[PDB]
Write a protein that binds this ligand. Structure first.
Ligand code: ZN
Ligand code: ZN
Ligand code: ZN
Ligand code: ZN
Lengths: 74, 71, 69, 71
């Protein structure tokens, strides 16, 4: 409503809109859902995502974006 | 194989989490009205009507940060 | 040790999926239009002002089954 | 709009049952939060050792991972 809130909300929504579309247009992902135990796929992908020791929340969210399509779609 | 998939998820996750511009936008948001912020951001996010799963996941990432800011 | 925490999370997750009434209520929404259902369901979930992580996770469980199905 | 009221009430109860479960909150609070990768993988490995990879279980792990990493 207020002008300060409307602008900060707009900028934040666009930034999250951009990251959201990057996940949905991830072509390496779209090809992976297409030897296929979902648990093993999840653990092999999850192991590779965190092999460098960095376990941050954005990576976990991306991992569960992957898990949702892996479980529900395929 | 699994490598390129996990690298792209690594790359997008590190954009959601370590983009300094995005983090300081999230940090500035009203910390004592999480319900009100969540719906304002969600309304602009889906004002174009495209209700894609990638955008819903990013919204839930922002909600998790809102609940953390209030905690 | 962590076997009890994993067993409890196991129980929670299986109780969600095996809740037929929940599955039926989720399968009874205008699937032609996901955005309006999400905002309607979410608006009624937080009218209390009770914006907790638990409720957000329950909305996430519903939103996924709504969009990806 | 009563079918949406009934569903919303169900999800409200599920979320509040999670957060008010003192035994669950105690078990979550006891893990080594300084070792999130090790904790997350040990819990996930035990949660899926039986071969059931259903979506409800993945969300329960997601509820755990969020409290493990954010707080
Ligand atoms: Zn305005
Ligand atoms: Zn980008
Ligand atoms: Zn304020
Ligand atoms: Zn330690």
């Amino acid at each position: 409503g207020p002008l300060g809130s409307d602008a900060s909300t707009k900028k934040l929504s666009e930034s999250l809109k951009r990251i959201g579309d990057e996940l949905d247009s991830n072509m390496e992902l779209q090809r992976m859902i297409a030897t296929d135990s979902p648990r093993e796929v999840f653990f092999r992908v999850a192991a590779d995502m965190f092999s460098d020791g960095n376990f941050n929340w954005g990576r976990v969210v991306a991992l569960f974006y992957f898990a949702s399509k892996l479980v529900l779609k395929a």
